[PDB]
Design an enzyme around this catalytic site. Sequence first.
Site, PDB file in Angstrom:
ATOM      1  CG  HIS A  84      -4.618  13.927   2.145  1.00  0.00           C
ATOM      2  ND1 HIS A  84      -4.985  13.124   2.876  1.00  0.00           N
ATOM      3  CD2 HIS A  84      -3.814  13.439   1.077  1.00  0.00           C
ATOM      4  CE1 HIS A  84      -4.211  11.885   2.458  1.00  0.00           C
ATOM      5  NE2 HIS A  84      -3.556  12.267   1.315  1.00  0.00           N
ATOM      6  CG  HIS A  88      -0.066  15.978  -0.512  1.00  0.00           C
ATOM      7  ND1 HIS A  88       0.994  14.953  -0.803  1.00  0.00           N
ATOM      8  CD2 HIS A  88      -1.199  15.287  -1.038  1.00  0.00           C
ATOM      9  CE1 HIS A  88       0.646  14.261  -1.455  1.00  0.00           C
ATOM     10  NE2 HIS A  88      -0.801  14.145  -1.479  1.00  0.00           N
ATOM     11  CG  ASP A 242      -0.421  10.786  -4.305  1.00  0.00           C
ATOM     12  OD1 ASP A 242      -0.268  11.661  -3.360  1.00  0.00           O
ATOM     13  OD2 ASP A 242      -1.534  10.298  -4.121  1.00  0.00           O
ATOM     14  CD  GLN A 293       6.557   6.457   6.966  1.00  0.00           C
ATOM     15  OE1 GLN A 293       6.940   6.469   5.669  1.00  0.00           O
ATOM     16  NE2 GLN A 293       5.156   6.646   7.315  1.00  0.00           N
ATOM     17  CG  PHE A 296       4.318   3.697   3.054  1.00  0.00           C
ATOM     18  CD1 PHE A 296       3.367   3.245   2.313  1.00  0.00           C
ATOM     19  CD2 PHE A 296       4.992   4.990   2.835  1.00  0.00           C
ATOM     20  CE1 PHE A 296       2.625   4.267   1.427  1.00  0.00           C
ATOM     21  CE2 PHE A 296       4.338   5.860   2.067  1.00  0.00           C
ATOM     22  CZ  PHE A 296       3.511   5.585   1.279  1.00  0.00           C
TER      23      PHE A 296
HETATM   24  C1  LIG Z   1       4.664   9.747   4.781  1.00  0.00           C
HETATM   25  O1  LIG Z   1       4.098   8.601   4.834  1.00  0.00           O
HETATM   26  C2  LIG Z   1       2.841   8.138   4.138  1.00  0.00           C
HETATM   27  C3  LIG Z   1       2.291   8.931   3.230  1.00  0.00           C
HETATM   28  C4  LIG Z   1       1.182   8.552   2.427  1.00  0.00           C
HETATM   29  C5  LIG Z   1       0.556   7.364   2.844  1.00  0.00           C
HETATM   30  C6  LIG Z   1      -0.918   7.108   2.286  1.00  0.00           C
HETATM   31  N1  LIG Z   1      -1.331   5.813   2.584  1.00  0.00           N
HETATM   32  N2  LIG Z   1      -2.363   5.439   1.917  1.00  0.00           N
HETATM   33  C7  LIG Z   1      -2.527   3.871   2.404  1.00  0.00           C
HETATM   34  C8  LIG Z   1      -3.162   3.666   3.595  1.00  0.00           C
HETATM   35  C9  LIG Z   1      -3.890   2.328   3.975  1.00  0.00           C
HETATM   36  C10 LIG Z   1      -2.779   1.494   4.592  1.00  0.00           C
HETATM   37  C11 LIG Z   1      -1.311   1.356   3.805  1.00  0.00           C
HETATM   38  C12 LIG Z   1      -1.620   1.624   2.310  1.00  0.00           C
HETATM   39  C13 LIG Z   1      -1.452   2.945   1.940  1.00  0.00           C
HETATM   40  C14 LIG Z   1      -3.273   5.929   1.178  1.00  0.00           C
HETATM   41  O2  LIG Z   1      -4.188   5.612   0.750  1.00  0.00           O
HETATM   42  C15 LIG Z   1      -2.892   7.542   1.041  1.00  0.00           C
HETATM   43  C16 LIG Z   1      -3.741   8.288   0.003  1.00  0.00           C
HETATM   44  C17 LIG Z   1      -3.099   8.238  -1.235  1.00  0.00           C
HETATM   45  C18 LIG Z   1      -1.849   7.596  -1.376  1.00  0.00           C
HETATM   46  C19 LIG Z   1      -1.092   7.360  -0.132  1.00  0.00           C
HETATM   47  C20 LIG Z   1      -1.377   7.778   1.173  1.00  0.00           C
HETATM   48  C21 LIG Z   1       0.982   6.822   4.178  1.00  0.00           C
HETATM   49  C22 LIG Z   1       2.186   7.225   4.742  1.00  0.00           C
HETATM   50  O3  LIG Z   1       2.688   6.399   5.562  1.00  0.00           O
HETATM   51  C23 LIG Z   1       1.842   5.972   6.829  1.00  0.00           C
HETATM   52  C24 LIG Z   1       2.147   4.471   6.820  1.00  0.00           C
HETATM   53  C25 LIG Z   1       1.770   3.541   5.769  1.00  0.00           C
HETATM   54  C26 LIG Z   1       1.792   2.134   6.200  1.00  0.00           C
HETATM   55  O4  LIG Z   1       1.787   1.400   4.955  1.00  0.00           O
HETATM   56  C27 LIG Z   1       2.016  -0.050   5.114  1.00  0.00           C
HETATM   57  C28 LIG Z   1       1.719  -0.694   3.862  1.00  0.00           C
HETATM   58  C29 LIG Z   1       1.793  -1.963   3.683  1.00  0.00           C
HETATM   59  C30 LIG Z   1       2.008  -2.782   4.770  1.00  0.00           C
HETATM   60  C31 LIG Z   1       2.180  -4.294   4.599  1.00  0.00           C
HETATM   61  N3  LIG Z   1       2.593  -5.129   5.757  1.00  0.00           N
HETATM   62  N4  LIG Z   1       2.412  -6.183   5.142  1.00  0.00           N
HETATM   63  N5  LIG Z   1       1.988  -6.304   4.007  1.00  0.00           N
HETATM   64  N6  LIG Z   1       1.714  -5.055   3.734  1.00  0.00           N
HETATM   65  C32 LIG Z   1       2.436  -2.330   5.977  1.00  0.00           C
HETATM   66  C33 LIG Z   1       2.313  -0.765   6.028  1.00  0.00           C
HETATM   67 MG   LIG Z   2      -5.819  11.212  -2.952  1.00  0.00          MG
HETATM   68 ZN   LIG Z   3      -2.289  12.721  -2.854  1.00  0.00          ZN
END
Ligand SMILES: COc1ccc(C2=NN(C3CCCCCC3)C(=O)[C@@H]3CC=CC[C@H]23)cc1OCCCCOc1ccc(-c2nnn[nH]2)cc1
Ligand SMILES: [Mg+2]
Ligand SMILES: [Zn+2]
EC number: 3.1.4.53
Length: 337
Positions: A84, A88, A242, A293, A296
């Site tokens: 961040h 980005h 985003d 990934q 995600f």
């Molecule tokens: C280049 O890779 C990224 C880029 C951005 C992010 C972000 N992430 N996040 C959140 C972090 C909490 C956990 C996952 C939700 C996303 C933010 O808030 C960040 C702030 C704003 C926008 C997106 C950003 C995360 C990135 O990858 C990291 C890996 C993400 C894994 O996500 C999963 C999602 C759901 C599942 C699942 N499995 N079963 N049910 N549901 C399993 C895994």
């Molecule tokens: Mg943000």
């Molecule tokens: Zn952002």
Amino acid sequence: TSISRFGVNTENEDHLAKELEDLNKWGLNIFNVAGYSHNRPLTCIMYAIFQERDLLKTFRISSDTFITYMMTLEDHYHSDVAYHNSLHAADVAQSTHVLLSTPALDAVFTDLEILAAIFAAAIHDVDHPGVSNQFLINTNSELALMYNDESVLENHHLAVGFKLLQEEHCDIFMNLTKKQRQTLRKMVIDMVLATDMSKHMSLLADLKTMVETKKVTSSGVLLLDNYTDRIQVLRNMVHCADLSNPTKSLELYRQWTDRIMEEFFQQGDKERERGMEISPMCDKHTASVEKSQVGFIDYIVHPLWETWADLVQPDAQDILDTLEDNRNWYQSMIPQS
Ligand SMILES: COc1ccc(C2=NN(C3CCCCCC3)C(=O)[C@@H]3CC=CC[C@H]23)cc1OCCCCOc1ccc(-c2nnn[nH]2)cc1
Ligand SMILES: [Mg+2]
Ligand SMILES: [Zn+2]
């Protein structure tokens, strides 16, 4: 000076100009732009986007004012935060700039709407400290106290971004009408707050109804009759930008992946030190980057992009194809039994 050509001072005018030839493309390389802008990708890309779109002329913003705001804005992103940071923000602004030109949308928005989305993108993570809302709430941090545990960062980003308009020669919105300002301000607040992932399911639901109810003009341009429809599409647009890292070419995506994990693990180490439970994803000793990934993508990025792509059918096909190719690359890299 080049500061007039590009908004920043760099000896590599020539290389920078080469990278900026892809300003209006998804395949722009913002890392390279950072390289050749003496690490000021935000100021640079915003300058480029404003020139390409004629927005300084249209809203009567002097370059002085524009460059001064952007350089201040950029200085309030933290360079020591792995993901961040200004790069980005630069990525997201540029990606939003491209999405705005989607042929099924290009005629649809006012210049004021175009201004708001791109300004929102630029500001949407300013003064990010490299830790989640939740970490901030659990550590009784000053920001969480200030914002009552609700969209703590996203509120702070808006605050900082609007506050910086008051510094010396930084008011880029001076020559808008009071009514223009009020409208812009509402739209920006709405878009930046929509970047909180706790709203993602809610935007997506709404985006999905835009699709089930999509009306098109005789030319193929989306018809969005009222403010609510318009801001719904734009807030989702900024959200897509985003969440665009996985829709970019693999080379770019992998770097975004390295950086986000670096940021997560920095948070996890701070959690370890304080004896807190380590948040999921944030433990360097146990994460599978590859499976993460793919999750995600399967649960957040692809559903969102599939619905965007239905809205703009077929104008986002190539983005969808790239995301699917990148998903399968990360899949193939998962360690097996
Ligand atoms: C280049 O890779 C990224 C880029 C951005 C992010 C972000 N992430 N996040 C959140 C972090 C909490 C956990 C996952 C939700 C996303 C933010 O808030 C960040 C702030 C704003 C926008 C997106 C950003 C995360 C990135 O990858 C990291 C890996 C993400 C894994 O996500 C999963 C999602 C759901 C599942 C699942 N499995 N079963 N049910 N549901 C399993 C895994
Ligand atoms: Mg943000
Ligand atoms: Zn952002």
